[PDB]
Amino acid sequence: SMNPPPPETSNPNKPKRQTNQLQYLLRVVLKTLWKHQFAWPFQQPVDAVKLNLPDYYKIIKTPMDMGTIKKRLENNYYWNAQECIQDFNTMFTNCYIYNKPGDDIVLMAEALEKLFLQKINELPTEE
Amino acid sequence: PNIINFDTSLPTSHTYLGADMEEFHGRTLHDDDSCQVIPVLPQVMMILIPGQTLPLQLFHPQEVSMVRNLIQKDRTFAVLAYSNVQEREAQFGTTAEIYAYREEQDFGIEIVKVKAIGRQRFKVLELRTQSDGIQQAKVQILPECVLPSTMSAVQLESLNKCQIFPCSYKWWQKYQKRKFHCANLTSWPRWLYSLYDAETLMDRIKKQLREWDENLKDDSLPSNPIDFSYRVAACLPIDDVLRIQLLKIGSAIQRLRCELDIMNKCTSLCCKQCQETEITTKNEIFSLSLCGPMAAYVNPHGYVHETLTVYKACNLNLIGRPSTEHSWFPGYAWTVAQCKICASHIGWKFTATKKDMSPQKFWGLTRSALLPTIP
Amino acid sequence: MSYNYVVTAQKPTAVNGCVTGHFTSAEDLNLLIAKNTRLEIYVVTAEGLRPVKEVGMYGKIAVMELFRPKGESKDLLFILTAKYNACILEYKQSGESIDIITRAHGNVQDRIGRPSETGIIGIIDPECRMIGLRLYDGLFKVIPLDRDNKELKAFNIRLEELHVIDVKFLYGCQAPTICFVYQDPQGRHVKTYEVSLREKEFNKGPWKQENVEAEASMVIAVPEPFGGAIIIGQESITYHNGDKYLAIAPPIIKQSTIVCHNRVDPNGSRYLLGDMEGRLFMLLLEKVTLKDLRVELLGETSIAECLTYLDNGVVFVGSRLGDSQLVKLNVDSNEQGSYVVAMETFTNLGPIVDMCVVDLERQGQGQLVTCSGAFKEGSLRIIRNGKLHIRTVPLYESPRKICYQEVSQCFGVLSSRIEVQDTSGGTTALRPSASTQALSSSVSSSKLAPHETSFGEEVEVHNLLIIDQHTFEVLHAHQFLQNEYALSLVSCKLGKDPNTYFIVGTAMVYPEEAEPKQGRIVVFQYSDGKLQTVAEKEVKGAVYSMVEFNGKLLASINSTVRLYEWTTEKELRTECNHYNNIMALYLKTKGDFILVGDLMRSVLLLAYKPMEGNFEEIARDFNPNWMSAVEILDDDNFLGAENAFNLFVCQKDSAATTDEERQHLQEVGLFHLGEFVNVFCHGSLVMQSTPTQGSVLFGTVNGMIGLVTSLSESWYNLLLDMQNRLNKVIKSVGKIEHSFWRSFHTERKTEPATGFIDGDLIESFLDISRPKMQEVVANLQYDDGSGMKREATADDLIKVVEELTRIH
Ligand SMILES: Cc1sc2c(c1C)C(c1ccc(Cl)cc1)=N[C@@H](CC(=O)NCCCCCCCCNC(=O)COc1cccc3c1C(=O)N([C@H]1CCC(=O)NC1=O)C3=O)c1nnc(C)n1-2
Ligand SMILES: [Zn+2]
- In order, the DSSP letters of B207-272 are HHHHTT--S-TTTSS-SSHHHHHHHHHHT----HHHHHHHHH--BHHHHHHHHHHHHHH--EEEET
CB contact under 8 A, C600 and B204: no
Q: Say if residue C391 is in the same domain as residue C281.
A: no
Are B161 and C218 inside 8 Å of each other by CB? yes
Q: Which residue in the set B59, B300, B325 is minimally distant from A107, CB to CB?
A: B59
Mutate to test the interface with C, among B157, B173, B181, B258 (most CBs of C within 10 A): B157
Residue B13 sits at φ, ψ, to 5 deg, of -75, -20
The answer to whether residues C631 and C493 belong to one domain is yes
CA geometry: angle at B167 spanning B161 and B170, to 5°?
45
| CATH number of the domain residue C721 falls in | 1.10.150.910
Q: In the PDB record, what is the listed experimental method?
A: X-ray
Torsion of CA C763, C766, C769, C774, to 10 degrees: 90
Nearest CA in chain A to B303: A104
The residue ranges of DSSP E strands in C430-496, in sequence order, are: 440-443, 458-468, 474-479, 484-492
User: Within 10 A of C152 (CB to CB), how many other CB atoms are there?
Assistant: 21
Ligand closest in space to the Cα of B11:
1
Please state whether the peptide bond connecting residue C351 to the residue before it is cis, i.e. omega within 30 degrees of 0.
Answer: yes
Residues C706 and C717 in one domain: no
Alpha-carbon gap, residue C198 to C155, rounded angstroms: 12
Report the alpha-carbon angle C182-C188-C189, nearest 5.
Answer: 70
Does the beta-carbon distance from B187 to C643 stay under 8 Å? Answer: no
Ligand nearest to the CA of B276: 2
Same domain, C266 and C380: no
Radius of gyration of chain B (CA): 22
Chains C and B touch (3+ CB pairs under 8 A): yes
Whose CA is closest to B39, among B79, B89, B99, B88? B79
Q: Which residues precede a break in chain B, with C-to-N distance above 2.5 Å?
A: 166
Is some CB atom of chain B closer than 8 A to the CB atom of C466? no
β C4-10/C756-758 pair status: parallel
Beta bridge partners of C61: C81
Greatest alpha-carbon span in chain A? 47
Structural domain boundaries in chain A:
19-123
CA distance A73 to B307: 38
Residues C459 and C492 in one domain: yes
d(CA B101, CA B114): 4
Three-state secondary structure call for residue C32: strand
Q: Are C1 and C651 in contact (CB under 8 A)?
A: yes
Instruction: Compute the distance between CA of residue B160 and CA of residue C150 in angstroms, rounded to an integer.
Output: 31
Residue of B nearest to C115 (CA): B148
Mark whether C169 and C28 lie in a shared domain: yes
Q: CA dist C272 to B156, C309, C419, C642, Å? A: 19, 8, 28, 37
Nearest to B107 among A35, A40, A111 (CB): A111
User: In this structure, are C41 and C183 located in the same domain?
Assistant: yes
- Please check whether residue B162 is in contact with residue C217, taking contact to mean a CB–CB distance below 8 angstroms: yes
Q: Listing from the earlier edge strand, what are the strands of the sheet with C139-144?
A: C121-124, C130-136, C139-144, C155-158
CA distance C188 to C170: 20
Instruction: Locate the ligand 1 atom nearest the alpha carbon of residue A95 and give its number.
Output: 56
Ligand 1 atom nearest to CA at B301? 13
- Establish whether residue A91 lines the binding site of ligand 1, counting it when its CB lies within 6 angstroms of any ligand atom: no
Is residue B256 within 8 Å of residue B198, measured between CB atoms?
A: yes
Last residue of a domain, one of C678, C710, C742: C710
C-alpha C79/C-alpha C122 separation (Å) is 9
For A113, nearest residue in chain B (alpha carbons): B108
What's chain A's Rg over C-alpha atoms?
15
The total of structural domains in chain C comes to: 3
User: Judging by beta carbons within 10 Å of its beta carbon (0-12, 13-18, 19+), is residue C771 exposed, middle or buried?
Assistant: exposed
Q: With contact defined as beta carbons under 8 Å apart, do A35 and A42 qualify?
A: no
Q: How far is CA C318 from CA B159, C37, C397, C582, C771, in A?
A: 15, 15, 20, 40, 40
Q: What is the B371 CA–ligand 1 centroid distance (Å)?
A: 24
Considering C313, C348, C383, which residue would you say is the last residue of a domain? C348
Q: Identify each DSSP E strand in C406-457 by its residue range.
A: 410-421, 427-429, 440-443
Shared-domain flag, residues C612 and C716: no
Residue B182 has φ and ψ, to the nearest 5°, of -60, -5
In this structure, the residue with its CA closest to atom 12 of ligand 1 is A105
Please indicate, yes or no, whether residues C543 and C651 belong to a single structural domain of this protein: yes
Resolution of this structure in Å: 3.3
C-beta atoms of C163 and B159 within 8 A = no
Q: How far is CA B123 from CA A72, B15, B80, B92, in A?
A: 57, 33, 9, 5
Q: Read off the CATH number of the domain in which C536 is found.
A: 2.130.10.10
CA distance C184 to chain B (A): 9
**What is the C-alpha to C-alpha distance for residues B15 and C328, in angstroms, rounded to an integer?**
80
Dist. CA C641–CA C679, nearest whole Å: 9
CATH number for the region A19-123 comes to: 1.20.920.10
C104 closest CA partner among C69, C130, C78:
C78
Q: Give residue C667's domain range.
A: 1-14+349-710
- Mark yes or no for CB contact C115/B194 under 8 Å: no
B366 lines ligand 1 (CB under 6 A): no
User: Residue C805 is inside which H or E element, if any?
Assistant: helix C794-805
- Distance CA(C552)–CA(C535), nearest Å, equals 15
DSSP state of C772: H
Domains assigned to chain B: 1-17+267-375 (2.170.150.20), 18-142 (2.30.130.40), 197-266 (1.20.58.1480)
Same domain, C336 and C429: no
What are residue C652's phi and psi, to 5 degrees? -120, 165
- The residues near B344 (Cβ < 8 Å, ≥ 6 apart) are B271, B272, B273, B274, B338, B369
